[model samples]
Structure formats: structure tokens, C-alpha cells
Target: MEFSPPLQRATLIQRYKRFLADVITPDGRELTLHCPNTGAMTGCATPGDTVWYSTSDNTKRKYPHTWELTQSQSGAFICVNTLWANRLTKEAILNESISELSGYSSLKSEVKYGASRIDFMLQADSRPDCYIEVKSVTLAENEQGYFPDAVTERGQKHLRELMSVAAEGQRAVIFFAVLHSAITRFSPARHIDEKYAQLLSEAQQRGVEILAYKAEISAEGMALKKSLPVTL
Candidate 1:
């Protein structure tokens, strides 16, 4: 995927309050940009990092610049926008890059299912529909990727929902869009949320498909490049 408006560069001053960040542009202007990520942003939100942001002409809204990507000290590009996980997954599926998820006659997003909205719903001519819940993996420790940098009750609930979908004879999936370029492997953050980790394993045992795809991230945009091994 390519950035439409193209991202502008800035130096991250600080990322705080979960959805707001202060950044200094090369021109020495300090501006507060909107952070689209809801996670703790561990290892991804350093103050000295380079922040790439998108601008908006919508005058009705505040914080016209939305933080898009981060270039860390390690020279790793990370897409901090959580919503891109679903988009890049959809792109991969559409372009037939995700072989397992290919061969679908139709695809839909934000479909209502159970108590929550599933990220992507795929269907083919003669098979059960596939229900996917996507998670953005940006927290990297020791070069290993982990989901939910913080405890996520909503993620736990999504696992339960996916399991239920699988129980009903549907193709249920929990997809991790690894957004950090430096992360080589993927796993659930058991130390952060043991319950979520346990539920994730249980969901796998119950036949919910687990897939992790690594993204080729740059200031240009993020795209699902290849599949990575998901460590349960």
C-alpha cells in the first residue's frame, strides 16, 4: 500500500494519553498529532524517534495531523495505527498474497458477528464462511513480536467470540498483522495478560485458525509481505 497524501516527517516529543502525541517538525514547529493506536505502544513510542504523520484538510476536527508510522532508533519502521492491520490484511487477501485466505468469491469488513464486529468476513462458492479478527503486533522484545502490549479485555472477548464462531462450524481465524519490521516471530503476550494468553491457546485448540503476517513497513505505507510462524 502506498500513502496517498504522503507522510510528513517529525521528531516525536512525547506520546501520551493513548491518543495524543507532541512532535516537532523540521521547521521547528511543535504540534500535537492524533495517535491512532490504543495499545501501550511499548518500544514503539520513544521520544527521540522519527514520526511520520498524515495531514487532513477537514477543518471541523482537532489535531489535523494523525500519527502514522514510527522510525525507531534501531531503524525499524513500525506502523502504530491499529486500524491499518485490517486494511493490510484485506489488501493481502484481495491480491491473493495470503494463500490460506485466498479463493474467496467475496469479502467484507466490519461485519457484525456475535457480540462484536469481526474484522473480515470471507466467502467462497462452496465452503463455510471465514471469520477473521485482526490484531496489530507492534511490541517487540528480544526481536520477538507480542500482541496487546498491555492487558486487553476486549481481545480476550474477541478470542471467545472466535471460538464460538468455530464451534458453529465456521472458519474462524485470529490474524496478527505484525507491524514492527524488527519482529521476527510472533506470540501472545502471556506475561502481560495471562488470561488472554490462556484463552488464545484454548481458541487454537478449539480449531480457530491462527495466522501471523509480517508487514513491510516504511514511511510510504504498510503492506502484508509474508506469513510468519505464530507461536501459540
Candidate 2:
């Protein structure tokens, strides 16, 4: 996937209370951007650094909103949040596939399932399909990335829903997008969320196709490059 408008350069001055970041724009304007607050940013972002950001049309707010920062070597931007980084990466891949797979310019995305909206509901060639969920894995312990830095009932629910669709002969898939370059293999975060892990294994064994892929990102853009191994 490619960055929509491409990434622009920015200088990160301070990240306040882990809620937002202060960045300097090229046109000499100081601005604040929202930061992902999951609190697992072990190596994603920090204060007082030069970084790259992409800006969206911030019509609802007076100040522009920027996100998906890429780390720079010259300063304190070492702790880059690759999870959110890879998420932004997957968004581009899914967007490009819509026309080819669904015969539409846009895929019907983020539809509510159970208590939350699933990542995508693809309708193409008169077929109904479900892309159940999106996951960000960053815990690379012992050469592995476990999902759900904490216990997640919601994650298990999504697995069960995927199983239902698979049973009904509908196309269903769970996409795990890993952010770190070192993590070449991904397994369900069984150590953190055991039930969800087991459910995922069962779902796959029962014919639900589980997809694991990796992407590389920089200050420029990201693309879905290679598929990673999924350990059941």
C-alpha cells in the first residue's frame, strides 16, 4: 500500500502526557497531532525528534491532524510505534484491492459485527465476503510477536464470528499485520490471551483462512511486500 498524498517532513518537539505530539511544520507553524494511546510504544515514538507525518483533511478541527510517523536517525525518534505504523500500512493495501477483488472503487469497510464494526465487508462479483478484523502485534519475545498486549474478550469474539461465516460457506479472513521488521513469524498471543489463541487455531483448522503479512514503511510510503508464517 502507498501513502495517499505521500509523507511530509516534520519535527517533533514534545509529546504531552502521551496524549498528543507537538510538531513543527515546514511552513513554520507549530501544531499538535494525536498519538495512539495503547501504551505499548516500546520503540515507536518519543519527544524532541525529527519525524515524518501524513496529514488528513482536518475539516472538523481548526488545527490539522497528522499521524503515522516514521522515525529519523538524527534525534530522539528511536521508539517508533510500528504497530500503528503497520496499521496505516494495511489500510492502503486493503484500499487498492477493493477494485480488483470487489469490482468497486471502495470496499464497504468497518461494518458493525456483534458489538463492534469488522474491518471490512467486501462485495464483489455478486458475492458477500467478510474481513473480520485487524490486529497489531509488536511483542517480539523469543523471535515471535504475540498480539493483545493485554487480555481481549473482543479479539476472541471476532474469531468466533469468523468461524460462523466460514461455516456458512461465506468468505472470511483474519488479517494480522505485524509492525516490526524483526518479527518474521506471528502466532496468536496465546501467552497473553490463551482462549483467543485457541479459538483462532480452531477456526483455522475448521477452514477459516488466516492471513499473515508484513510491510515496510519509511518517511515515504508503505506496501504489502511479503507473507509471514502463521503458527497455529
Candidate 3:
């Protein structure tokens, strides 16, 4: 998808208060932009890094400036908005850009499966339904990327959900929207959260398909550009 009213540049002072980030714009205005990501944002929110923010036309909003992209200290471009992952994945699916998820007659999102809502559900006329759980990956360190920047209990629960879907003999997918430009490869963060890493591997072994794709990001916009291999 393309960025409307193109993103404005700012220097990140800090990301704090859970969903708020302090940034200094080119005009020297220190603004508190709304950070859409709820993750720990490790290595992604370095002070003095370029923060590209988008302004909303909605007047009911308190903070109109929404933190969208981060040009990290190491020249890595990352989409900090977690919500964009779902929409971008939907766009790719509707356009049939994602090759792994093809031959589906119809697509639906935020589909309720048991106690959880999956990111997407694709169904073919004669095939079993495909359930996809999408995650945004922005935790990049030394050109390596990982998911669940923090120890996510909810993330762990999603793996279990995917496993159950696989057990139902349906197509279950674990889709990763890798938003880090510097990260050439992708893997589960076993060092940070070993349990999540283990469950991720287990999900794969249990027939939950994995689709890790890199997003080509810019001030212009972000899109799923290429599929990356999920290493363990």
C-alpha cells in the first residue's frame, strides 16, 4: 500500500508510555507521536534515528502524528506500525501477490476460530479452509531479525491456536511480515523467549505452514516484496 500525504521525517527522542514516542521534527517542534507498536521495539527505537510519521485528517484524535517508519541508526528501514501488517497481508492476498496462498476461491480476515480470531481465512471450492495468523517482525539486531520482541503470552497462545487448526486437517499458516530492511534472514527469538521459539518450531512440525516475507519500506509506502526463509 502507498502512503498518502507522504510521511514526514522526525528524529526520535524516545519511545515511552507504552504507545507514545517523542520526536523532533525538521522545524524543531518536539511532538509526541502515537506509536502504533506495542512490542518492546528493541534496537528499532534508537535515539536520533529518523522517524517517519503520518498525519491524520481525523479531528477527534488527540495525537494526529502517527509513527509509521523508522530509519534506524544502521540505515535499516522498518515499519513500526504493527496494525499495518494485517492490512498489507490482506492487500497481497487480494492481489494474489503471495504465491504460497494461491488457488483460494475467497478470502476473509479476522475470522473467529474457537476462542481466537485468526488474521485471515482462505477457502477454496473443494479444499479445506486456510487459516493465517499474521505477525509483524521489527526486532532486528546486527542484521538478524526475530519475532515477539518481548515475551508475549498472547503470541504463545496463537501458536497453540494454529496447532489446533492444523489438527482439524485444515491449512494453517503462520505469516510473518518482516518489516526490517536490514534483516536478510528470519528466525524465532530463541534467546529471548525459548518457549515461544520451541512452540514456533512445533507449530511448523505440526503442519502449520510458515510464510516469512520481507516488506519493502520507504517514505513512499510499504509492500510485501520478497519471501524470506524461516530458519528454525
Candidate 4:
């Protein structure tokens, strides 16, 4: 996916309250930008890191600039916007880049299932209904990517719902979009969220498909370039 107006460069000063960040633009002006990520951010957010943000001309919003991407000291780019994962995945499926999820006649977004809303619902005349749940992975440690940087009750719930769909003989998938360029493999952060890890394992054992795709991130745009090995 391409950033229409392109992103503005900024140096992150600090991120606080899980929704606000202080940054200094290239012009030396200091401003507060909206933080779209709710995770702990872990290794992704550093005070001196170079970051990119998108601006909106919408007059009703308090903070017009939204945090988009981060550049690590090692020069790796990480897309921090959580919502972009689904869009990138959809693009990949549409372009036939994701062969496992391709060939569906219809693709639906934000479809309600069970007690929660799934990211995507894929259907075709001959295939079983497929439900997709997408997660953005940016936390990297020792060159490996991990999910739920913080404990996520919501993530665990999603796993349970996916397992339910699988029990009913439908196809369910957990798609991890690896936004950090340094990560070549995906793993569950069991140390941080043991319950979520257990549920994830159970979901897979129950036949829910788990997939990870690494992204090629740059100032120009972000796209899922290839599939990465998912380690339970």
C-alpha cells in the first residue's frame, strides 16, 4: 500500500499515555502526534528514533498527525500503524501474492463472527468460508519477531473464537504481519502472555491455520514481501 500524501519525518521525543507522542519535525518545530498503536511498543519506540507520521486536514480532530512508521538505529524500518496490516494483507491476497488465501470470489472486511469482529471473511462457491484475523508485529528481539508485546486479553479471545469456527468445520487463520524488517521469523511472546500463548497453541492444534508474512517497509510504502516461518 502507498501513502497518498507521503509521510513527514520526525524525531520521536517520547510516547506516553498509549495514545500521544512528542516529536520534533525536520523544521525544528515540536508537536504532539496521535499514536495509533496500543501495544507496549517494546523495542519499537525509542526517544531518539526517527519516525514518520501522516497528517490529516480533518478540522474536527485534535491531533492531525498520526504516527505511521519508525526507523530503528540499525536502519530498519517498522510500520507502527496497526490498521495497515489488514490493508496490506488484503492487497497481497488481491494481487495473488498470498497463494494460500487466493482464489476467493469475495472478500469481506470487519465481519462480525461469534462474540467479536474478524478482520476478513473470504468466501467462494466451492471453498469453505474462511475467517482471517490479522495482527501487526513490530516487537523484535534477538532478530526474531513476537506478538502481543503486552498481555492481550483481546488476542486470547480472538484465538478462542477462531477455534470455535474451526470446530464448526470452517477455515480460520491467524495472520501475523511482520512490520519490522529485521524479523525473519515469528513467535508467540509466551513470557509476556502465557495464557494467550497457550490458547494460540490450542487453536493451531485444533486446525486453525497460522501464517506470518514479513513486510518490505520504506518511506515510499509498505507491502508484504514474503512469508516467514511461524514458530509456536
Candidate 5:
């Protein structure tokens, strides 16, 4: 998605409380930006890393600037805003950029199913309902992307729900939106969350589709550029 009004450049000072970050603009002004990610952020949030933020003129808001992207020391672009994963994925699907998820007659977002809400529900006249769950991946290690930078009980629950939908003979998908340009492959962060890893494996065995798409991000815009290999 293209960032309207463009993004402002800054250097990250630190991120804390899972939703706040301190950053210094190029002109030497320090400000607090709303951190849009809740994961540990791993290598994505270095103290001196270059960051891109978007500002709001909404007078009722507390922190007007929101963290959008991160530039690592190695020059890799990472989109830290977790909410963008679903938005970008929806755009890609509507534009037929993702061939695997195309051909749906209708697309619905934030649809409640069972105990939780799904990211997207696709319906076609000749096919069963396709339930899609989206996860944003920002943690990269050894040129590979991993999910759940920290322990995620919510992720595990989603897997269980997807498996249930799959058992009903409907299509269920776990779409990993890899937002880091440096990550060439995607895998479960087994070392960080073993239970989640195991559940993911089980979900796959139960016929839940797994897909990974890498995004091309810059200060100007971001979009799902290509599909990447998902390494279980």
C-alpha cells in the first residue's frame, strides 16, 4: 500500500511497552511514535536503525506518529506494521496478484467464525468457502523468516480453528505475509514456540493450506511482490 503524505525518516531510539517507541527525526527532534507491532521484533528494532513513520493530524490522538517501516543496518527493509499484512493481502487478492487465492466471487473481511474472527472469507459459486488467516512475519535470522517472534497462544488457537474448518471439507489457509526484504524463506520459529510449531505441523497434515508471500517495501510504498518457499 502506498503511504499517503509519504513517511518521515527517523532513527529509532528504543521500543517499549509493546506499543510505544522513541525516535529522533533527522532534524534532531525526539518524538514518540505508536509501535504497530506486538511481537518481540527481534532484529527488526535495533536502537539506531532507520525507521519510517506516518503522522496524523487528528487532534484527539495521543501519539500522532505511527511506526511503519524499519531499515536495518544491513540495508534490509522491514514493514513493522502488523495491520498492513491483511490490507496488502486483500489488495493482492482483489488485483489477482496471488494466483492461488484468485477466482473468488466474493471476499469478506473480519468475518467471525466459531471462536475467533478470520482475516478473509472467500466464496465462489462452484467451490466451498475459503477461510484465510493472515500473519505478519518480521523476524529474520540467517536469511530465513520466522513467525511468532515470541510465544503466541493466539496463533496456536488459530491453528486449531483452521484445522476444524479443514476437517469440515472447506478450504482453510494460513497465509504468511513476510514483510522483511532480507528473508528468502519462511519457517516456524520452533525454538521460540515449540507448541505452536507442533500445532502448525498438525494443521498442515489436516489439510490447511500454507502460503508465504514476500513483500517489497520502501518508504514510498509496500506490496506483495512474490511468493516465497514455506519451510514448515
Candidate 6:
């Protein structure tokens, strides 16, 4: 997938506090971005490192922004603080995925699905359109990617909505965005949210496309890097 707003540049001032950083523009102004809370970033990132990162123009109030550390001077920053990375990665994937698809134009963001709005919706010259749902995964264990480090009925509800769209013969895609490059793959949080995992598996079996991609994080910004392995 392609990174939206394009990853410009970044610098790592402080890699602690579970944060990744990036210098926004050539003017030298910097934004302190957070890192994903996933374990993939076990040993990546260090202070004063030049790293590549991506960003999403739209962000929540608390975070107000997200960043991913792509290339770093110290490999120690490779797998540390992934929560921020996940957000940036997901934004990259969405932009890239939309760019990849043909005949699917008129991009619409934050379309409602079920009780809450999913990530995106695309329309074409057809009756039924495509619905895309994006999720950020930071929690990881034993080489498996998990979601919502905490309980999330909202997440589970979205999965069900994805299934509903799929049943209606409309394409529905669930994308798991891994915040850091260290993660090799993604899986539902079976231990933390076993039911959600089961539901996700069933959704995939029912024709809901499940996809996972990893992104490169850096102090500058994050970039949608590449697709990673996915597990049901």
C-alpha cells in the first residue's frame, strides 16, 4: 500500500516513553509522536537517530497524531513502541489499497458500519460498493500480532458488520496494520479477546478478506512498507 501525504522526513530525539519521533517539514519544526505498544518493537529505536516515518493527517484528540519509525541509526529501535507505528501503518495501507484498486473511485472516509463507522468506503459504477475496515495491532506474543491490548466490544462489533457486508455480496476487507517492521505476522487477540478472534476467523471463512501489513517507523514519519504474514 502507498503512504498518504507521503512520508517526508524525521529525526529521533527521544525513543523512550513508548514514543517515536519525526521532523515534519524542512523548516525544522518537530512533533513528538508515540510508538505502538506492541512487542515487535522489542529493540528498535535510540535517541538522536535519523529514522524514516509516515503520518496520517487525520488523528484523534489525545494522540493528535501518529508516527512510525522506518529506518533508524540504531537497530535497537527496530521493535519497540509500536502503538503509534500501527496507526501510521494503517493509514498508509488504506491509502495504498485505495490506490491499488481499479474502477473504485470517489474515496469516502469514516463511513458508518453497524453501530460505528468503519475506516473507508469506495464507490464505483455498480450498485453495491466496497467497505473497508482497518484496525491497528500492537499487542504481540510468540510472534503473533494481537489487537486492542484491552477489551473492545466495539472491535468485535465491527467484525460482525464486516461479515454482514460480505453476506450482502459487497466486498468487505479487514486490514490489520502492524506498527513496526519487526512483526512478521498478525493474529487476533485470542487470549485477551478470544471471542473476537473466533469471530474474525469465522468472518474470513465467510469471505471477508483479512489482510495484514507492516510499516517502517522513524523519527521523521511513518511509511506503508510491505505486507506481512497473516494468521486466522
TM-score to native of every candidate shown: 0.96, 0.68, 0.96, 0.96, 0.97, 0.62
RMSD of each: 1.3, 5.0, 1.2, 1.3, 1.1, 6.8
Model 1 per-residue lDDT tens digits across residues 101-170: 9888999989996637888999988989999888888899867998778888888988999998999999
**Ten residues in sequence with the least summed lDDT for candidate 1:** 217-226
Point out the worst 10-residue segment of candidate 5 by lDDT: 55-64
Number of the top-ranking candidate, with lDDT as the measure: 5
Query: lDDT score of model 3?
Result: 0.89
Backbone Cα, N, C clashes tallied per candidate: 0, 7, 0, 0, 0, 38
Q: Judging by lDDT, tell me the better candidate of 3 and 6.
A: 3
Off by over 4 Å in 1: none
What is the overall TM-score of model 5 with all chains considered together? 0.97
Per-residue lDDT tens digits for candidate 5, residues 1-232, read: 7999899999999999999999999899999999988778889899999999998886778998899999999999999987898999999999988899999999999999773889999999999999999999998996889988889998898899999999999999999999999999999999999999899999999999999999999999999979999877
Query: Which residue pairs of candidate 1 clash?
Result: none
Model 6: ten consecutive residues of lowest lDDT:
74-83
- Alpha carbon deviation, residue 100, candidate 3 (Å): 0.4
lDDT of 4 by residue, 125-216 (tens): 99999999998898899688898888989788889999999999999999998999999998999998989988889999999999999999
Error of 1 at 197 (Å): 1.0
Residue pairs in steric clash, candidate 4? Answer: none
Candidate 6 CA-lDDT value: 0.61
* lDDT (C-alpha) at residue 85 in model 3: 92
Q: Residue by residue across 1-232, what tens digits does model 3's lDDT show?
A: 9999899999999999879999998999899999988778887788999999999896778898899999988788989887899999988888878988978989997788684898899998899999999998988877688987778888999899999999999999999999989888899999988999999999989999888888999999988878887798
TM-score of 6: 0.62
Which residue pairs clash in candidate 2? Answer: 1-223, 43-79, 43-80, 44-79, 44-80, 44-81, 45-79
Candidate 5 runs further than 4 Å off: none
